[PDB]
Symmetry: D2
């Protein structure tokens, strides 16, 4: 038995070489993750073909060793920003991967703000499954949060200082049902920098615009209050925020506010998780229990080269539902610098404390098969990128975000 | 000796089959026109490769016999709206061809307003020649005259009644110097229909916006005055107008106002050519002499099936320069219904009256080689589409606009 | 749920347009046959991708309406000579399809005897599954039965009169286990015509060569005796014969002798089935019972246009095993001219007489889904091509050979 | 002005990535050589497109740094064995490049003797120019000198010890007239090793077979006599010989015998050049004058690393005409180990002694533009590979054979 990625790399014809290389790098990772999760073979085939047609052509050039060909500058390494494997208790794991759609010539004068890649990707996703990509929220939030090509090109003197000119990021939720639902992120840093406004008063103003235009109830009050305070900006890198929404029926879609932060103690972490105490209840408590566990399990150890932790880098997503007024957080703990060995051990011990034997097995399976550099290289710091904790009435919701192109950093 | 189109169709690899079919149909036409003009062989190769990479992928599906696959509705037949061969006295002929960039899925829910094709085409043209496609005017006139995908998708109830939802048209001026300069048309029918404004007060308001933003002097006063009158709207189909501009340095670029018209006598034709008398001088006179000659030479004859001329369909371009206040007209006489034999004979007799022996030879050469249905079928009404008369201090400027996909209508 | 053929035609990139058209035509047929048989979804994907990579590029040009582009002349219409669905009692149905591998330029001076297509196909099949295509028998029978390109090109004056210059035919047995085992046919008509020998004394001499070179026991004596008689040549078209062998381990492979025939009564049919009585036993009897049933069930009816049966066209395969001395026949009844309605009704009544309810359901399913012209057009004579009867100790073995490109003949 | 290789790499679509990489590596070299020679632009385009369609797909995988993917073993580095630029006095320079056509899977069980690549290449060359590739001599010498796939696969125990299993090598003579005439080499090492015969008695026996079959007079007597002696085998590596012939009209084609040799003094060199004195006249004298000049100009110097010359490696081609009995030699001096600086200086001083100013300029132009490692790296030993001296009644005929993939060895 050949596995779908091998057989497909053998038979498939690729428009470009960089697509072939991105395939050789990721398709193993994605396919092994999907197969260890428990996907059916035809779903592996469908999602790998989606990746081959829709995604890979909208990843950008492949990094040669000196990364000379990569003209679309970014602080993150090229490729999918992450590939995620969800872990709940009772509900089945799901594979995801978010990608900043980069065009083949983005960063160059021909496509200096990469306007088409995300739209080409949305188009391919809609064509491979008609009626699966609803652009009702995309089309409302695009003029408010995102900058078209023309604006960014005539408002260039205003943004040419920005390093990462990202304006939209697509997160595809590859489902066990072969349905690849999309999820678009809009970082308004470009738009705010052009209009000289703030991320808060633009993100949330657009959210309220969509509220009144739809009648859907997206209560952003808690989040605006918190993110508008002083001691939050004290640590918050508000310029690394973005608004996320599911490209679905706005009634059944969700909106999420995201921001980064460099905290030093669990009190600031609870500040972000809780929105300054404005969010409480049993779920906040039971969630921060696990956040604290993983905090003092991961950030309690040595970094490579014997360096010291200046601070703890975190990220946070607050999800607001359409029919409710609830806001639910999701805290990222960044481990780009940690030992993949230490991160994996922490994840495993957490899962065991939760009683998740099946999930530790799945985790180590994906680890050894898709990410061989954790077992081969005892000082690897490339596979794991973030770990995300969220708590729902179902129970915990942990989410290990790995780098699929970790084979490129080794 | 194989000629470039044959050899290229033999060696070239095409992404899609429709590209191969469009090649088989057009590349003969374009290459024969370029070769009869007097292009060099390498320029033929360069322009045919431009067509193969930039253009053909942004033409749309190829019409099967029932035209079942063509989802992007249009009153014109699919393919390039026209392929033009210029004819002056002293300056060398030039090949052109304007195309409404259609995506492979335009008209379908995945790309219901065809937003990407023109941008993809502009991108390819800029990448094949960096710094040859200046988007200074494109980026200013895009929000004013053209509708992005999102707007058109949420403002759909306002435009879903329109048959031709064209919003941008690219005219590539393939030059003897291998340089393929672009030229973008913006028909604001979508934008005006959404904003419930008029083509006049939107086109010219955008022109004045660009004036004040640039300092370049585009005197639109004559054209606004005329096109705002009553007896002009009496005949004018103002909903078939568009603003044209060369995607170049705005200093060296030109802006052109276009409108259609169904006139019955040469007095209305002089109304449009002259802007109600506001334009005069030796050039207007010497130009309308030739317009009258060709009028009573072409519209003086029988239509196929023995039908009668309800009226004479014309189009008109008024060009406004950046450094001057001059406006120069260019009158189209539509011959979509006439006998290609009669149209060719009229063109030939005109050229002979002008003393253009070389040009009648070139014309008949292109006719017999690229358009064999004029000699084979004595009742052909498909090759020729329009003839355009303009008069400059150089002399006359006649321009025969043929349909390259005339092989598809036979 | 999109079915594999639709989704694959949506995502897959095709080297050539003719591959896209062959896909649109066959992949529905093949996929519907495989799905009605009961194949798993991933096996459908694997086999359709095999068809897309290995087979389709080695089918030849796609027939336009006038079939102008088809330079490789053949009495059969272009495309797969047949697509077969096996029907046994107890063992699961299997899909097959034999194709004369035609190159993209076969019949033209560049590839006037189509030498590469079959080898390219064998190569692709071996690369998509290493060690699945054993060329031990192919490499022994190639010089004996088949003509290389050079020989056929210098021995051209000797064969240029032949209409069908076929020299090798590949029958792929797409298995429910995703394994696509090959099966090569060698019609020695070219070789015999060059060497001025007879099909009998070349086919069987090569078989004996392989016997002595291998030690495997392929008893051809019965078949040589019969096919060398006089009254068999009376009806036999010995020039339509070929030697078949499974490209596998010669120990586990089988060899088959094939010949056509135009008989008029069941006595000549029993002559061919029995090898002039030399083959007998319970199986021959029980097999000719069914041959007679289907004979007087199909050839007992009207042809289109009210024409009369000059004679009954049949074909016959005698399989010889490696470890045994048994020879087992397989009689084809050609129905290219009959009513697809009559043929389907006969097949259904036969299956019912055998008690094969599941198989009549599968048959009508494949009929209505893959071959809609049998239900739409009540006078269709294109879907069905042959029906093949063989009898093994398992029971009967009927095999309905349909034309997949029947959509092209309607 | 973009030059053809840049523009073509920008617009062209490549089936495979390795084709793109081979393009990036060679097309600069080939195009710069053709442009420095003085080719027209359209001829550059034609030949680069020939390379893109016919050749590049039949070069094999592209060498990654560890050359892990290269399964077709060879003592030479992958890519074109050489790219040649001819230099005469009076006749215009010509570009050539010989390539061992390697399939994408050659060396692996799927194509273990690489039988198709050369045939695919011949087919493409014949299709891009019908009637330009005459296979009259190819089809006669193929069974005699070359081993089909089947023979080599069943006669594997006899050849599996050979390192380089080359059996046919195509040398394309890209002409200023855009005509790419082919030239096929047959090294009978495989055939001789299978039939346990000698290269002499097989090559020359096949030549005599073609003589009697054609009536063309290819007098091989001198060459058979010499190559059959004892003191020639003393130095000759007869296992590195091959028979060459132009794939043209056998009347106008030429046959050439090739052999390698490791000589130590100019007396053995004159032995090979002269066929043991059997060849004489003014031309032999005037040719060996130049051979001696270049011998003591190149082999008179230091090797890298301060190593010593065990012996001088040479190669020799004796051309036999169809209508005459003349045999004309062509002596290769191998400089794979020498300093590209020393080799270039020797070539330049030779040309100057001949009065070839234009040619030294062309040579240094090709050097600095196509082979930058001779000027950048003062210890480069990769660009130049061989230098070939032949003398015709026109005058000298020197031929500098460079490695185009020298960019891969740096």
């Amino acid at each position: 038995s050949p596995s779908p990625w091998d057989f497909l790399g053998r038979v498939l014809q690729f428009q470009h070489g960089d697509h072939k290389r991105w395939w050789d790098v990721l398709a193993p990772v994605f396919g092994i993750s999907m197969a260890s999760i428990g996907y059916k073979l035809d779903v592996q085939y469908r999602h790998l073909l989606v990746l081959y047609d829709a995604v890979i052509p909208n990843m950008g050039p492949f990094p040669n060793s000196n990364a000379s060909n990569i003209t679309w500058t970014s602080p993150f390494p090229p490729g999918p920003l992450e590939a995620s494997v969800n872990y709940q208790a009772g509900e089945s794991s799901m594979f995801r991967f978010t990608i900043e759609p980069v065009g083949p010539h983005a960063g160059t004068p021909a496509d200096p703000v990469n306007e088409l890649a995300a739209k080409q990707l949305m188009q391919r996703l809609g064509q491979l499954q008609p009626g699966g990509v609803d652009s009702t929220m995309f089309d409302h939030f695009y003029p408010l949060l995102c900058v078209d090509g023309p604006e960014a090109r005539r408002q260039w003197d205003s943004i040419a200082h920005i390093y990462h000119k990202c304006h939209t990021v697509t997160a595809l939720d590859m489902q066990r049902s072969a349905a690849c639902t999309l999820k678009t992120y809009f970082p308004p840093l470009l738009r705010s920098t052009i209009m000289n406004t703030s991320m808060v008063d633009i993100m949330f103003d657009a959210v309220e615009s969509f509220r009144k235009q739809s009648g859907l109830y997206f209560d952003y009050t808690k989040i605006k209050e918190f993110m508008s305070e002083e001691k939050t900006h004290e640590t918050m890198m508000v310029d690394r925020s973005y608004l996320s929404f599911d490209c679905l029926d706005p009634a059944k879609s969700r909106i999420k506010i995201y921001t980064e932060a460099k905290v030093k103690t669990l009190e600031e972490a609870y500040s972000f998780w809780s929105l300054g105490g404005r969010l409480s209840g049993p779920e906040i408590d039971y969630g921060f229990k696990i956040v604290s566990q993983m905090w003092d399990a991961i950030y309690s150890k040595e970094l490579p080269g014997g360096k010291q932790r200046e601070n703890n880098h975190i990220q946070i997503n607050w999800e607001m539902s359409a029919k409710d007024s609830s806001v639910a957080p999701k805290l990222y703990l960044t481990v780009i610098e940690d030992y993949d060995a230490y991160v994996s051990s922490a994840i495993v011990d957490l899962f065991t404390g939760l009683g998740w034997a099946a999930h530790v097995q799945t985790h180590k399976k994906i680890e050894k098969e898709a990410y061989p550099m954790c077992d081969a290289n005892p000082q690897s710091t490339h596979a794991y990128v973030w770990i995300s904790l969220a708590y729902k009435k179902t129970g915990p919701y942990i989410t290990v975000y790995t780098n699929p192109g970790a084979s490129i950093l080794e």
